[PDB]
Design goal:
207 residues, mainly alpha, Endonuclease Iii, domain 2, Endonuclease III, domain 1, 2 domains, 12 helices, globular, binds chloride ion, DNA damage, alkylated DNA binding, DNA_glycosylase
Length: 207
């Protein structure tokens, strides 16, 4: 299993590598600079945030996480296990999200997932353990690795927007080939695909 690649501290090297693909050379120059992501000091809390916010507006997502933070002991595994399913519903969580949050907390206290020690674990091992939680599939696990843990080399082949972008920009090409070239910077490449979609949604000119 590939060794864990550290988060980027700057994007200069990444953009030069990606810019070897003339499609990304254009996309990166049209979209400009993207902020450098810092790996979270609290993977558990960031997982709960992600789960809680799913399908909600940005303001609603922040609000509900704020209500979780307000429960006794906050967004900490042992504390969350002492809150009733009824009081978790009470903060506004769907039953599906209650079950996911309880399952994640339970996995933390039982040692099934060691959220304090993810940094040494290869992407696929972290993914496999997250996937075993109800309501967390591969896509959610991969989004977590990319955005929460700031891992540099994640291409989520289940992300509709990424796949549509590759289809659009590289018609007739094998996506596995296209995206392999971007390694070891598939996460930044993905973020530039999402940025390009947002650019097009704002009225931008196509490639
Ligand atoms: Cl909800
Ligand atoms: Cl998922």
């Amino acid at each position: 299993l590939p060794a864990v690649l550290p988060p980027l501290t700057d994007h200069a090297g990444a953009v030069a590598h990606l810019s070897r693909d003339p499609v990304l050379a254009q996309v990166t120059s049209l979209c400009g600079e993207l902020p450098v992501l810092a790996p979270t000091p609290d993977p558990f809390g960031r997982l709960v945030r992600s789960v809680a916010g799913q399908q909600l507006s940005v303001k609603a997502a922040q609000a509900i996480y704020g209500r979780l933070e307000g429960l006794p002991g906050g967004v900490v595994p042992a504390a969350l296990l002492k809150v009733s399913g009824d009081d978790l519903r009470g903060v506004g969580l769907s039953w599906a999200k209650v079950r996911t949050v309880q399952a994640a907390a339970a996995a933390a206290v039982s040692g099934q997932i060691d959220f304090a020690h993810l940094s040494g674990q290869p992407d696929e091992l972290v993914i496999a353990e997250l996937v075993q939680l109800p309501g967390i599939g591969r896509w959610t696990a991969e989004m977590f690795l990319l955005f929460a843990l700031a891992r540099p080399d994640v291409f989520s082949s289940g992300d509709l927007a990424l796949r549509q972008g590759v289809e659009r920009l590289y018609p007739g090409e094998d996506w596995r080939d296209v995206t392999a070239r971007w390694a070891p910077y598939r996460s930044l490449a993905s973020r530039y695909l999402w940025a390009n979609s947002a650019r097009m949604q704002a009225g931008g000119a196509p490639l």
